[PDB]
Amino acid sequence: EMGQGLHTKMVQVASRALKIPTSKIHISETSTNTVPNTSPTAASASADLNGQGVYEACQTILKRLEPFKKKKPTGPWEAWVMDAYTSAVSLSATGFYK
Amino acid sequence: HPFLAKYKVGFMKTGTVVALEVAHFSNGGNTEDLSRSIMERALFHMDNAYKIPNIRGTGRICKTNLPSNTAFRGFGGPQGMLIAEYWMSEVAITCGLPAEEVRRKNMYKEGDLTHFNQKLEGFTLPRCWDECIASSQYLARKREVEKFNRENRWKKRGLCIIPTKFGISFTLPFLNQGGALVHVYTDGSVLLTHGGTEMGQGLHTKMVQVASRALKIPTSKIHISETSTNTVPNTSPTAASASADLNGQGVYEACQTILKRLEPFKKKKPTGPWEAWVMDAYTSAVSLSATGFYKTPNLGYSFETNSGNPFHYFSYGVACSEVEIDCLTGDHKNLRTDIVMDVGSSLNPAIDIGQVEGAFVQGLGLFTMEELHYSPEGSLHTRGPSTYKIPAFGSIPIEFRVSLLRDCPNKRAIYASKAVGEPPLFLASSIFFAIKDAIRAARAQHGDNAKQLFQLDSPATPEKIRNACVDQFTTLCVTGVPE
Amino acid sequence: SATLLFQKDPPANVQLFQEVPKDQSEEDMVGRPLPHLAANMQASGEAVYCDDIPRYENELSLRLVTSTRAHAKITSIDTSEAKKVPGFVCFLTAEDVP
Amino acid sequence: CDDIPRYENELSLRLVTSTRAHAKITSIDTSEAKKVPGFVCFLTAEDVPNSNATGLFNDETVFAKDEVTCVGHIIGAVVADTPEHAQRAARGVKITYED
Amino acid sequence: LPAIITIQDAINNNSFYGSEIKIEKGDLKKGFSEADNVVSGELYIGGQE
Amino acid sequence: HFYLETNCTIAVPKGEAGEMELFVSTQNTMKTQSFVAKMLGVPDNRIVVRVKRMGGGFGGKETRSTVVSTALALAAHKTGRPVRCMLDRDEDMLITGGR
Amino acid sequence: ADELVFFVNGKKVVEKNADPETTLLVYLRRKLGLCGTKLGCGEGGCGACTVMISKYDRLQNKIVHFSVNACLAPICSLHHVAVTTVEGIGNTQKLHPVQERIARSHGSQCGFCTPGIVMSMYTLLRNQPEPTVEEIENAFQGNLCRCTGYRPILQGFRTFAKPSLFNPEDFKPLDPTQEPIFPPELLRLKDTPQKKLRFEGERVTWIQASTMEELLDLKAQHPDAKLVVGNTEIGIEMKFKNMLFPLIVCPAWIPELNSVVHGPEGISFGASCPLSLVESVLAEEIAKLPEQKTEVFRGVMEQLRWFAGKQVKSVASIGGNIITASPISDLNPVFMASGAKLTLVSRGTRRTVRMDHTFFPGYRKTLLRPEEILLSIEIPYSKEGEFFSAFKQASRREDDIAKVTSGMRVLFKPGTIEVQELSLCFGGMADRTISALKTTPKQLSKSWNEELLQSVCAGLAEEL
Ligand SMILES: Cc1cc2nc3c(=O)[nH]c(=O)nc-3n(C[C@H](O)[C@H](O)[C@H](O)COP(=O)(O)OP(=O)(O)OC[C@H]3O[C@@H](n4cnc5c(N)ncnc54)[C@H](O)[C@@H]3O)c2cc1C
Ligand SMILES: NC(=O)C1=CN([C@@H]2O[C@H](COP(=O)(O)OP(=O)(O)OC[C@H]3O[C@@H](n4cnc5c(N)ncnc54)[C@H](O)[C@@H]3O)[C@@H](O)[C@H]2O)C=CC1
Ligand code: FES
Ligand code: FES
Ligand SMILES: [Ca+2]
Secondary structure: OOOHHHHHHHHHHHHHHOOOOHHHHOOOOOOOOOOOOOOOOOOOOHHHHHHHHHHHHHHHHHHHHHHHHHHHOOHHHHOOOHHHHHHHOOOOOOOOOO | OOOOEEEEEEEEOOEEEEEEEEEEEEEOOOOOOOHHHHHHHHHHHOOOOEEEEEEEEEEEOOOOOHHHHHHHHOOHHHHHHHHHHHHHHHHHHHOOOOHHHHHHEEEEOOOOOOOOEEEOOOOOHHHHHHHHHHHHHHHHHHHHHHHHHHHOOEEEEEEEEEEEEEOOOOOOOOHOOOEEEEEEOOOOEEEEEEEEOOOOOOOHHHHHHHHHHHHHHHHHHHHEEEOOOOOOOOOOOOOOOOOOOHHHHHHHHHHHHHHHHHHHHHHOOOOHHHHHHHHHHHHHHOOOEEEEEEEOOOOOEEEEOEEOOOOEEEEEEEEEEEEEEEEEOOOEEEEEEEEEOOOOOOOOHHHHHHHHHHHHHHHHHHHHHOOOOEEEOOOOOOOOOOOOOOOOOOHOOOEEEEEEEEOOOOOHHHHHHHOOOOOOOHHHHHHHHHHHHHHHHHHHHHOOOOOOOOOOOOOOOOOHHHHOOOOHHHHHHHHOOOO | OOOOOOOOOOOOOOOOHHHHHHHHHHHHOOOOOOOOOHHHHHHOOOOHHHHHHHOEEOOOOOOOOOOOOOOOOOOOOOOHHHHOOOOOOOOOOOOOOO | OOOOEEEEEEEEEEEEEEEOEEEEEEEOOOHHHOOOOOOOEEEEEHHOOOOOOOOOOOOOOOOOOOEEEOOEEEEEEEEEHHHHHHHHHHOOEEEEEOO | OOOOOOOOOOOHHHOEEEOOOOEEEEEEHHHOOOEEEEEEEEEEOOOOO | OOOOOOOEEEEEEEHHHHOOOEEOOOHHHHHHHHHHHHHHOOHHEEEEEEEEOOOOOOOOOOOOHHHHHHHHHHHHHHHHOOEEEEEEEEHHHHHHHOO | OOEEEEEEOOOOEEEEOOOOEEEHHHHHHHHHOOOOOOOOOOOOOOOOEEEEEEEEEEOOOOEEEEEEEEOEEEEHHHHOOOEHHHHHHEEOEOOOHHHHHHHHOOOOOOOOOHHHEEEHHHHHHHOOOOOOHHHHHHOOOOOOOOOOHHHHHHHHHHOOOOOOOOOOOHHHOHHHOOOOOOOHHHHHHHHOOOOOOOEOOOOOOEOOOHHHHHHHHHHHHHOOEEEEOOOOHHHHHHOOOOOOOEEEEOOOOHOOOOOEEEOOEEEEEEEOOOOHHHHHHHHHHHHHHHHHHHHOOOOOHHHHHHOOOHHHHHOOOOHHHHHHHHOOOHHHHHHHHOOOOOEEEEOOEEEEEOOOHHHHHOOOOOOOOOOEEEEEEEOOOOOOOOOOOOOEEOOOOOOOOOOOOEEEEEEEEEOOOOOEEEEEEEEOOOOOEEEOOOHHHHHOOOOOHHHHHHHHHHHHHHHO
16 A cells, blocks of 8 residues: 555455445555565556455355355354354455466 | 362272262352363263263362363363272272273273263274383382382382373364465465464474475475464464364465465476476466365264264373382372373374473372462462472483384374374373372381272372371371370 | 482483384475474574563553452552552553443 | 654664765775764675675665765665664765775 | 352352253163172362462 | 655564564565565565555655665664664655656 | 673673662563563572573682572672673574583473573583583472473483484584683772672662671661672562562672681581582581581581572572571571571671570561671581481472471480480471470480380470
């Protein structure tokens, strides 16, 4: 983030991808030990590249929650997440795009 | 948790036990915390190594105005098992049969069900037992103990061999899960993290060894820096001896993902080095970051139907210990301990032997040295090393022998290993029962009957040892009489 | 033996374990007695534990205040003497929990 | 970045740069730098543990060695207790050039 | 206020965390009746820091 | 570029295994990490670069930020103490180049 | 003056505003940033804070080296000494043999106790480059480890004395000539005579006395001035019993309080002599004199085997134990049973007392007047037909508080087994050290036989 509102856009993307309000999603910082081998934030490309990466990480999560969403079709987001955790389903995912 | 137990055991003249009823009470303190799960594990281990056809254990956790008691290496197990070993000692004494024979004949066989109905498969305990009996020269040393005791009125020796079975897995099934995150930077160096925390048990060392095997690169190329909630979320505590099992699998899966991504570059350059494959994958825009996850399958016990497996597998081990007590002061020396431990195919025998010895010495403290004192109004008096006496350099057995069982791979855990953290702690009860044997030798010298079942609470401190060695001095002090 | 001054024989230790298979790679360390990775730094006092982390210039210190009674009502709390101590910042209680 | 609180043991650095567009460095004199209270050290190419070659195409120095190739070429860095002491010490680093 | 300190204080006051936990298998009445010997006792095990 | 926040790095050495954490106003964490690691002679897995936000970059912090980061990482390694440098505007305009 | 000057790892530290409440541990960690030295208990029991002190001993014209608990060492006590921490002996770029061997032998698990154990072993080697296995174990009486079970530490260090988990053949050899130089400055500074120092903190003033006259004058005008030598009681009272003594005087530099004098009746030790000095002189005397002469000496030595460990005995004074007057002092029963002679001084007075029941009139009280100090204690030679035993039983053998501790002496009429004198003294049986004075007089002129045993036992059962 250098003022171009990249984190704002990524939260907007993730919120649509996960179908949850932006208020439930937070980006704190950028670090080499969370995402490695990153291109510079440059070439106006960062929302395109990171947006796709964010979208894909979110799709992995949604795919893991689907059996719990299917069982409790209206039960809130928080119910599916606690159900996934107590069923020992991973709630962490990487995403990537080229 | 302090435990109080009320037991009743029925047995044959052969020493075969046929009925066991035990009520347990624990002192939980002023919040629930882990107390009920601790009581569950004690109940799971009230059999120790013994098949008992008619059995009833109950547990109650007391709510008290004391600081809240919690998890401690063993987690109710050592308390449940010492009770088992205590009535078992009384069964042998009552029958007039050697303790080691009575224990052996009551031991489970391969394929037996426990009192909670889990099948004992890959039951290596009889092997640990026979190897320890043999390497400790137990029967020859029994004779030398007997001879020392004939030649010495005011010092007595005692010798005891004790087995153990310890169930591996959190008693709350969903906690048996683990996560990892791995990065490969473009110089080919690997940054690894997992949910486990380093507290001296060498977990990061084992995970680096695991990752190095999984990736087929030297350990020198792999680094773990720290544990953080923002690299691996929703982690179970580093507890239940489970962490290398759980995180090892997670680490392994993250590494497999990386290898699968590198395989076409490995195919293009079959001999070209790791660094070439990694740079090739990077400049072909292939992801060099992966999560890994694992959950232990098929777990879940029900107390209502007494069915379902609480544990993934069991750890087994046996310890033989010899002591020499000073009947006039209550002091004793730990002369020799032999331990044979099934750690599966050890991930790191240096770390695993370190864990056996460390765990054993904490149990030695639990059963013989470490005592907490409270005012009648519930204020802890014991608040530092001056009054709380943990084992010192001089407290350890003079001959200290540890063997890891050979040829016993455990397929269902990472690279055929077994967890090692907690299981050996209880084996220090061999010192407690060696002391009880020494005390019995001292009591017989005062004419006080064999087959007499005198009281020895835990810990067996100098106070408890000295008071139990009844003689002309104790008699004079207590009642005012002797000769 | 009642009159003997305390004395032990010298220690005699034996550690037995299994060698890894003969054709296991020397770079494959699983089952080998690799020393704890931090052992050298621990021996040298270079390993960092929580309190070894340097303090920030603006860092503050906390001390817990605990009950001296097993079971009692708290009828009052007086912090007047506390407030006189140089460097005193605040006393936190249940009221302060957000 | 600079809003982050300083550690109690934190030091300040000041870069020392070339005042010539193309010249040989013939000597560096830090006599005056060393007189500034709080002075710790002056880092040069000699202090680099591994490689002094940097930049996207590996054609740049971390610190100038033997020659400077622009006005602004980083020759070294003063380390001091405070930014004020670092600036004063960096002024006392005297460089001699041959154009 | 009235304090409950020891295990026996708690038993006397019915001060417990939840209900009794129990595992039972087989036939105790028959087990005890057909045994050659019966031995009963109590054991106390201190805590640990 | 005249980003309102000039180039800035804090390097925090961790005293174990060559581990270092850098807090940097940079558009390029990867090259910051690589250039620091290569200068120090440690693997990339020892160096962590963190960026919360920059007060502007506009391309000027895509590579040129590293001339501050490396000098600072070196001072931190040498001293075993955290070290910080924020460039003055005159320093930044001179050293870091432009379009 | 008022500047505090010492060395840490060979580097001069000048502290212009030394607070008497500052310990060495806090100073190393928070002022110098040297965090290798750990806090594990703050009460002398764990050894995690063990460091080495070197100083020039003006009495002996020699450099001495000893370990101490940094958690209990006031920095105001350390003027003109050299401190060595784990950082001073080596690092991962060049490990000291002590460091390398504990690491490679798997003697370091969590690693928090490791620097303190390293420093205890290091200190032993500076004093004895080739120790016995017994000396090695004795070095660690004041070090605790919760992880390793001790075995690998002792086994790795055994290589310094006189498939496998590690290879002792790959260990780098020890070259004692390569240890850090004793700071030349401190050798130059010992040429200048020591003067009184005053340190003023937020709550406490510390006076480092240089002469007896200074000390006695201070005690005369301010009898409330609290003497501190090793700080192994006072440090505990301040930190744990919330005691504050606004005026402290440290008499440790004073020659008369540090002297060892061999006399006709025994050996007198200055009251500030550390327990480690008492141990070293009595050991020499036990080795060279006839057994007949050394019964009381061997009684003291038996007690000192089980008295704390090296770090505490390096700074703990003999007079500090006597004056603290704890009911469970391990030495007072022995001094009482032997009737050791104490010299008491104030400004304008000097008197002698043989320690007996009257020396301890109440709980933690002695017969000393507020302005008096203990100057010396004479530990006596035993006579022909005089025998002595000392006993201690605690909860643990090593570094523990006695439940009962005892000194016992018998003198026999010459050539006989008939009792001339009998003294049985006990700690841990009352609010002070006591003598069994109802039981023992009944035994005089009795023969040492079963009837005497039974009479003493019945007497003790009633009296105690
Ligand atoms: C870890 C540890 C283990 C211990 N183990 C034992 C043990 O096994 N047995 C045992 O008996 N004690 C033990 N102690 C207690 C203590 O170490 C001894 O009592 C020690 O000798 C006190 O000496 P000091 O110089 O440190 O006294 P300080 O703390 O400096 O002073 C103690 C008291 O003596 C007074 N004093 C000192 N010198 C004089 C003087 N010459 N004239 C008049 N008053 C004086 C002081 O004013 C103060 O009241 C232990 C303490 C610790 C911390
Ligand atoms: N820190 C350590 O590891 C060690 C410390 N020391 C000594 O232990 C002392 C502990 O101090 P405190 O807790 O204040 O203990 P204290 O000095 O008050 O002594 C307590 C002991 O005195 C006896 N006692 C006291 N009053 C009695 C009475 N009325 N009747 C019968 N017996 C009575 C009992 O034996 C009791 O255990 C320290 O000051 C130190 O001198 C000794 C060994 C080890
Ligand atoms: S910290 Fe435990 S002895 Fe100093
Ligand atoms: S290794 Fe952890 S206490 Fe010694
Ligand atoms: Ca609890």
